[PDB]
Design a protein around this ligand. Structure first.
Ligand SMILES: *[C@@H]1O[C@H](CO)[C@@H](O[C@@H]2O[C@H](CO)[C@@H](O[C@@H]3O[C@H](CO[C@H]4O[C@H](CO[C@H]5O[C@H](CO)[C@@H](O)[C@H](O)[C@@H]5O)[C@@H](O)[C@H](O[C@H]5O[C@H](CO)[C@@H](O)[C@H](O)[C@@H]5O)[C@@H]4O)[C@@H](O)[C@H](O[C@H]4O[C@H](CO[C@H]5O[C@H](CO)[C@@H](O)[C@H](O)[C@@H]5O)[C@@H](O)[C@H](O)[C@@H]4O[C@H]4O[C@H](CO)[C@@H](O)[C@H](O)[C@@H]4O[C@H]4O[C@H](CO)[C@@H](O)[C@H](O)[C@@H]4O)[C@@H]3O)[C@H](O)[C@H]2NC(C)=O)[C@H](O)[C@H]1NC(C)=O
Ligand SMILES: *[C@@H]1O[C@H](CO)[C@@H](O[C@@H]2O[C@H](CO)[C@@H](O[C@@H]3O[C@H](CO[C@H]4O[C@H](CO)[C@@H](O)[C@H](O)[C@@H]4O)[C@@H](O)[C@H](O[C@H]4O[C@H](CO)[C@@H](O)[C@H](O)[C@@H]4O[C@H]4O[C@H](CO)[C@@H](O)[C@H](O)[C@@H]4O[C@H]4O[C@H](CO)[C@@H](O)[C@H](O)[C@@H]4O)[C@@H]3O)[C@H](O)[C@H]2NC(C)=O)[C@H](O)[C@H]1NC(C)=O
Ligand SMILES: OC[C@H]1O[C@@H](O[C@H]2[C@@H](OC[C@H]3O[C@@H](O[C@H]4[C@H](O)[C@@H](O)[C@H](O)O[C@@H]4CO)[C@H](O)[C@@H](O)[C@@H]3O[C@@H]3O[C@H](CO[C@H]4OC[C@@H](O)[C@H](O)[C@H]4O)[C@@H](O[C@@H]4O[C@H](CO[C@H]5OC[C@@H](O)[C@H](O)[C@H]5O)[C@@H](O)[C@H](O)[C@H]4O)[C@H](O)[C@H]3O)OC[C@@H](O)[C@@H]2O)[C@H](O)[C@@H](O)[C@H]1O
Ligand SMILES: *[C@@H]1O[C@H](CO)[C@@H](O[C@@H]2O[C@H](CO)[C@@H](O[C@@H]3O[C@H](CO)[C@@H](O)[C@H](O)[C@@H]3O)[C@H](O)[C@H]2NC(C)=O)[C@H](O)[C@H]1NC(C)=O
Ligand code: NAG
Ligand code: NAG
Ligand code: NAG
Ligand code: NAG
Ligand code: BGC
Ligand code: MAN
Ligand code: MG
Length: 550
């Protein structure tokens, strides 16, 4: 149908997948609802993609939510021509800077295309979905080979019967875009399995019979759930069994798709909620695994996770170096990975409590055969080797005389300068000086029936790192408020609750969600909430209690 005037440099799906490594998501933008500035990001501007290219990414994934841009319903399901034009212009912002693109159908997946809901009209879902990709395929028919199409984001899928419906999603998609013509018959596509989960995909994905597009599989990876989602008090990552769990997940997917190009379309241990040493060990090992199993990774970034689009600053430059220079071996700060350990340490920090003396701090590092070249603080000062710090094996020691030029027994708590360590190769990790103390809350108790309706914001005086580590929740009689099974999760996991589901924080508050409050009212029992902070030196010192009464 569509007729393109120029030429099209055909590329195989293997080469496309090889050429996009690594990618970066334009998250919470064209996927935001109803408009691209409806969530946390402003209107997309082109300089964003300059920062992305400058950082070493070779591609951008471009999630688009179409739900709120239809100007007619059945049977045409016309998409707003201004929206199609906005998607097309932003793709042109990406490609014109030499970056590959992958554009999809995003939150439509659960907003209207959910086949697991008991009332879903599968006929209407299939018809609207065909019409949608016919229109996107028409608008984007003449894009270069650097533009690929992804079926649909994480489609909900619980059973084999649902898995057959996700396969049909891939088939309806291929038929629509080939019918739209232009260059689409030779365009690289990304096909999807249930939830974009490695296991559901392995179980139920079937290659569309007689497919003729060059095609790659895409999945998403947010495992392990406890670390990545900050659930049940998990604040560490890197044991031998954590590594084997991760390598097993990627290898069993590759094992089911031996000769198929595989895109890892989203992953992120976000700097917002995860501990940095565990975060950098996780990203390092994930990148190592994607190279082992020949997968191209694309990091998720919602605008607040990594790149600050208004300044070009990446909030976590160590992860970006790890993801963008995959042929280099990284020296990393060590950290506690033992879930039975009664104390948690991290070499991404130099911690010092208010009211304690200044002492030498030895930080164990994983050198990985790199040597340390230099250390420079965030004011520009290069540290004097063998005076401001000394190296012994994997240890880096900072003498008390040097550390006391940054803090004292009585200095104010908060974030101090950090140290950037330059090694022979690989990422340059960051050690963060934190002067900490036990935080205080404006309220120590409250009646459940007086704070109700909404989330409970409790104003807090942060003393050190302005981040919450987890929240313990115990009923008065000793029963856990939620999730019994955390009794098997060690001193720092027993009775702990989950980020966003149960607890949250902001600049001025710690937060207990409305569902946490309603869970106390239902239990009918006073519940003690122990807010816990970094360093997790033990289970009690660096914590503060709030009691919800009944
Ligand atoms: C936020 O709020 C929370 C909740 O309110 C606060 O946590 C609470 O902190 C307090 C204070 O620290 C804890 O009290 C201590 O608890 C000890 C018993 O704990 C164990 O049992 C309880 C009770 O279980 C009942 O309920 C459960 C429900 O399921 C049932 O299963 C069970 O059958 C019972 O019915 C459990 O709740 C508790 O579990 C917690 O901890 C475990 C880990 O251990 C976790 O896994 C759980 O999730 C849970 O968190 C646990 O199993 C008890 O030993 C202890 O009594 C001693 O200490 C008192 C205080 O001593 C300090 O202060 C003194 C100054 O006055 C100093 O002298 C002292 O050295 C110390 O600094 C003493 O007053 C008391 O006499 C006891 O002293 C004895 O032991 C000391 C230590 O060994 C010695 O120094 C003493 O000399 C003395 O030893 C002598 O006597 C003993 C006994 O006779 C002999 O054994 C010994 O040989 C010797 O002769 C104290 O009561 C409380 O447990 C805890 N609650 C919870 C739910 O966590 C939290 O602090 C707060 N945080 C903040 C920051 O504000
Ligand atoms: C080691 O230590 C050093 C300390 O020396 C650490 O360096 C600091 O790192 C910070 C985090 O990376 C960084 O903070 C950012 O600064 C930006 C401003 O930078 C420029 O100005 C300052 C002077 O003020 C200069 O110093 C600096 O060099 C630059 O010139 C801000 O742009 C950033 O704010 C955004 O992020 C924070 C969270 O990180 C948000 O709270 C904040 O609201 C901003 O995010 C909004 O805006 C973006 C759009 O850009 C949206 O995508 C996002 O959703 C948010 O949107 C809301 O708000 C907008 C309004 O803007 C609205 O449109 C929208 O609807 C939403 O409501 C950020 O604050 C420090 O500058 C940096 N300091 C220095 C000296 O370098 C370093 O991290 C340490 N390293 C490690 C590894 O620990
Ligand atoms: O990590 C994938 C991997 O997980 C294995 O399962 C292990 C993992 O379980 C996570 C789930 O735990 C449930 O709690 C269970 C617990 O697992 C049991 O141990 C215990 O006995 O019972 C507990 C409860 O009875 C939690 O209830 C679940 O919430 C959790 O799954 C995660 O759910 C969140 C949020 O889900 C919401 O919607 C549905 C509903 O279930 C839930 O209540 C709601 O809050 C998901 O967040 C979404 O994440 C996507 C991105 O993730 C996508 O990308 C890659 C795929 O792997 C994902 O499947 C896919 O969803 C994001 O875009 C959305 O915005 C978020 O809403 C998480 O994705 C879910 O992981 O941890 C502990 C262990 O016990 C389990 O064995 C599983 O077996 C593997 O096959 C593999 O899938
Ligand atoms: C292709 O992918 C499938 C789906 O992931 C892989 O099959 C799965 O293999 C794992 C590990 O071999 C099985 O888990 C094990 O199961 C038993 C009880 O279920 C337990 O003793 C073990 O601790 C472990 O959890 C899993 O059940 C199995 N699933 C299915 C449907 O067979 C398969 O291995 C992959 N194929 C290749 C060639 O990589
Ligand atoms: C389901 O969708 C089809 C196609 O739009 C329509 O003909 C049918 O009436 C719908 N079913 C119901 C119960 O609304
Ligand atoms: C695929 O192509 C063959 C022709 O070689 C055709 O006979 C067959 O029906 C097609 N498969 C399906 C599942 O329609
Ligand atoms: C490294 O530090 C630990 C803890 O201080 C110490 O026990 C160990 O002997 C040190 N190792 C070397 C090689 O200096
Ligand atoms: C504690 O109270 C809860 C809620 O009131 C109840 O379900 C549970 O059985 C009680 N357990 C004990 C040990 O008292
Ligand atoms: O926090 C930024 C945004 O995140 C999204 O995941 C939520 O759905 C939005 O409601 C929220 O504004
Ligand atoms: C954190 O934990 C480790 C041991 O796990 C210590 O070496 C460190 O000093 C801190 O207590
Ligand atoms: Mg998402």
């Amino acid at each position: 149908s569509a007729n393109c005037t120029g030429s099209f440099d055909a590329i195989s799906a293997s080469d496309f997948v090889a050429n996009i490594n690594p990618g970066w998501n334009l998250g919470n933008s064209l996927d935001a609802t109803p408009n691209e500035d409806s969530w946390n990001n402003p209107t997309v501007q082109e300089s964003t993609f300059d920062y992305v290219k400058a950082a070493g990414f070779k591609s951008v994934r471009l999630p688009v939510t179409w739900t709120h841009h239809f100007t007619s319903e059945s049977p045409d399901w016309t998409v707003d021509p201004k929206w199609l034009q906005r998607v097309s212009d932003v793709i042109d912002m990406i490609t014109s800077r030499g970056l590959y693109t992958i554009v999809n159908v995003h939150h439509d997946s659960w907003e209207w295309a959910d086949v697991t809901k008991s009332d879903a009209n599968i006929t209407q879902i299939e018809q609207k979905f065909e019409k949608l990709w016919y229109q996107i395929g028409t608008k984007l028919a003449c894009k270069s080979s650097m533009v690929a199409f992804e079926t649909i984001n994480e489609p909900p899928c619980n059973t084999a019967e649902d898995g057959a419906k996700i396969n049909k999603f891939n088939e309806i998609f291929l038929r629509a875009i080939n019918r739209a013509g232009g260059f689409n018959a030779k365009r690289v596509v990304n096909l999807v399995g249930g939830g974009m989960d490695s296991v559901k995909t392995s179980q139920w994905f079937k290659t569309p019979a007689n497919i003729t597009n060059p095609w790659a599989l895409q999945f998403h990876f947010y495992s392990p759930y406890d670390f990545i989602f900050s659930a049940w008090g998990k604040t560490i990552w890197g044991s031998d069994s954590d590594k084997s769990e991760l390598d097993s997940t990627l290898g069993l997917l590759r094992g089911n798709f031996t000769d198929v190009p595989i895109v890892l379309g989203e992953f992120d241990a976000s700097p917002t909620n995860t501990e940095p040493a565990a975060r950098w060990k996780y990203h390092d090992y994930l990148i190592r695994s994607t190279k082992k199993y020949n997968m191209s990774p694309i990091i998720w970034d919602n605008g607040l996770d990594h790149l600050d689009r208004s300044s070009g600053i990446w909030r976590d430059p160590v992860s970006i170096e790890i993801i963008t220079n995959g042929n280099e071996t990284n020296s990393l700060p060590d950290s506690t990975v033992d879930t039975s350990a009664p104390s948690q340490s991290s070499s991404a920090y130099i911690y010092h409590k208010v009211g304690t003396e200044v002492t030498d701090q030895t930080l164990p590092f994983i050198f990985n055969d790199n040597t340390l070249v230099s250390i420079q603080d965030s004011k520009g000062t290069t540290l004097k080797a063998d005076t401001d710090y000394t190296v012994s094996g994997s240890n880096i020691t900072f003498p008390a005389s040097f550390l006391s030029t940054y803090y004292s027994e009585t200095s104010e708590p908060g974030l101090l300068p950090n140290f950037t360590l330059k090694f022979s190769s690989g990422a340059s990790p960051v050690v963060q000086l934190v002067q900490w103390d036990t935080p205080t809350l404006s309220k120590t108790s409250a009646a459940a029936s007086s704070i109700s309706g909404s989330d409970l914001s409790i104003p807090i005086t942060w003393k050190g790192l302005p981040k919450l580590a987890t929240v313990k929740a115990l009923l008065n009689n000793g029963t856990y408020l939620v999730d019994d099974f955390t009794q098997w999760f060690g001193p720092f996991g027993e009775a702990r609750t989950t980020y966003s589901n149960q607890w949250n924080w902001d600049d001025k508050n710690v937060i207990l969600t409305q569902a946490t409050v309603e869970a106390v009212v239902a239990a009918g029992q006073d519940t003690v909430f122990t807010f816990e902070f970094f360093p997790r030196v033990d289970t009690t010192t660096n914590t503060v209690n709030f009691t919800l009464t009944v």
